[PDB]
């Protein structure tokens, strides 16, 4: 089979900036080379055709080179609808072949997140579990750090992270860190804080209940 | 105009086999070749096959010759692909896309997303994540509700039945021992809570179930 390569799975850029992603295959492909954008829905929509060919509702923006194995796909002047992840697709003949594609993220101006913390709910408590919630919002860049500390105790297990998709309208993400424990772990301690570490500060975000109400 | 629309999410056991649809509309179906692809986490995009409608012709990939069947019913205006011995490795969203004039995959499905696994399906548990007794005030405030313990993929979380959409953050799912989790939190007015019904509405196809959690105030 002709393999398709992607020069990189990521790209960073910011808004206004040329954007380029590349695509390189195995044999001469002529002109057969085909671009996709896959939106986080999962909704894929075709924007260049035959190496330099825009399809439909494709902005001006793009446009598309190829020498019949190294192409890309150029976009001059970034937008914030460019938000995705970019394929090519080679279509000489079957089989057809894809690039395992670039995620596209908006590199934005840095962004402290807001930070808030949510006991467990009484409903979770007389069921035997307690859960906590540290929730980070709209901030940038991504990287993010959360350490929970249980009675002035840093506690890593039974935690588990996960951000949102790149805010498709001002760039920002959020993250949640949640603490798993049962009930009875949980009605043992008192102080429960979450801390952030983000690059907009030196010094954490800290955030804190006690289960004493007090 | 051109639309594809593909069935929904399958749980299916290893071994087993699956059988999906993609129902076009809007366009001469026998006259267009219809071509399925399956996209596997860190696999990229993957060319199955593709049919001609009008006289029944297909072509495979090698590797999925007796592996998946491509068929079509005219009278139906639909495209189905039957994939057979599943494996883990056959768990993806798989794809009908349709093919030409002049143009190559132009018009694509929403894609069908295939679980192959042994577990059962499980229900999520939803808890509501409302601010501590002791939290500082201010004009807005954040809400949200914990879903915990699903299995499959996906569940899908709206506010107030979709009224709701401005500042809501949906994280991504997470799979822990089998299980998914995930959270889905909004920041609205204080005016607007506890004044009127926040509600979160919790879906999960694969057990069919719509709930709902109500946000409340803590009990004082
Ligand atoms: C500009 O470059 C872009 O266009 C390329 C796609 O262009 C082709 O799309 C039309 C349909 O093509 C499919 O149908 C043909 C016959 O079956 C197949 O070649 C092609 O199918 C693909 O190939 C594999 C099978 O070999 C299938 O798996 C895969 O789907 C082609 O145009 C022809 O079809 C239309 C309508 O039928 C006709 O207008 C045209 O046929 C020509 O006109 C005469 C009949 O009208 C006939 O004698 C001539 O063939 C077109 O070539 C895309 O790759 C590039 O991005």
């Known amino acids: 089979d002709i393999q398709m390569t992607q020069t990189t799975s990521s790209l960073s850029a910011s808004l206004g900036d040329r954007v380029t992603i590349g695509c390189r295959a195995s044999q001469d492909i002529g002109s057969y080379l085909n671009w996709y954008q896959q939106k986080p829905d999962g909704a894929v929509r075709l924007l260049i055709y035959?190496?330099?060919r825009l399809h439909s509702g494709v902005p001006s923006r793009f446009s598309g080179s190829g020498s019949g194995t190294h192409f890309s796909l150029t976009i001059s002047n970034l937008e914030q609808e460019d938000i995705g992840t970019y394929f090519c697709?080679?279509?000489?003949?079957?089989?057809?072949?894809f690039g395992s594609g670039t995620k596209l993220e908006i590199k934005r101006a840095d962004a402290a997140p807001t930070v808030s913390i949510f006991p467990p709910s009484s409903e979770q408590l007389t069921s035997g579990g307690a859960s906590v919630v540290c929730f980070l919002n709209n901030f940038y860049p991504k990287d993010i750090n959360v350490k929970w500390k249980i009675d002035g105790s840093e506690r890593q297990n039974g935690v588990l992270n996960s951000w949102t998709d790149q805010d498709s309208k001002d760039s920002t993400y959020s993250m949640s860190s949640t603490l798993t424990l049962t009930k009875d772990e949980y009605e043992r301690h008192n102080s429960y804080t979450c801390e952030a570490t983000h690059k907009t500060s030196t010094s954490p975000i800290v955030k804190s209940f006690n289960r004493n109400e007090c | 105009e051109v639309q594809l629309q593909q069935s929904g999410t399958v749980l299916a056991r290893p071994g087993t086999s699956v059988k999906m649809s993609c129902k076009a509309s809007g366009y001469s179906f026998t006259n267009y070749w219809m071509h399925w692809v399956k996209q596997r986490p860190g696999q990229g995009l993957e060319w199955i096959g593709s049919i001609y409608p009008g006289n029944s012709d297909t072509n495979y990939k090698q590797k999925f010759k007796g592996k998946a069947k491509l068929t079509a019913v005219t009278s139906a205006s639909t495209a189905y692909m039957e994939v057979n011995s599943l494996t883990n490795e056959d768990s993806a969203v798989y794809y009908c896309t349709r093919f030409g004039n002049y143009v190559p995959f132009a018009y694509w499905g929403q894609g069908t997303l295939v679980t192959v696994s042994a577990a059962t399906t499980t229900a999520p548990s939803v808890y509501p994540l409302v601010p501590g007794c002791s939290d500082t005030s201010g004009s807005s405030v954040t809400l949200g509700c914990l879903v915990k313990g699903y299995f499959p993929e996906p569940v899908t979380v709206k506010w107030n039945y979709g009224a709701l959409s401005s500042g809501v953050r949906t994280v991504s799912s997470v799979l822990q021992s089998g299980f998914y989790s995930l959270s889905s939190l909004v920041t609205v007015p204080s005016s607007t809570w506890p004044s009127q019904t926040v509600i979160c509405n919790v879906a999960h196809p694969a057990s069919k179930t719509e709930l709902i959690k109500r946000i409340e105030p803590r009990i004082p």
């Open positions: 697709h080679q279509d000489t003949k079957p089989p057809y072949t």
């Open positions: 035959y190496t330099s």
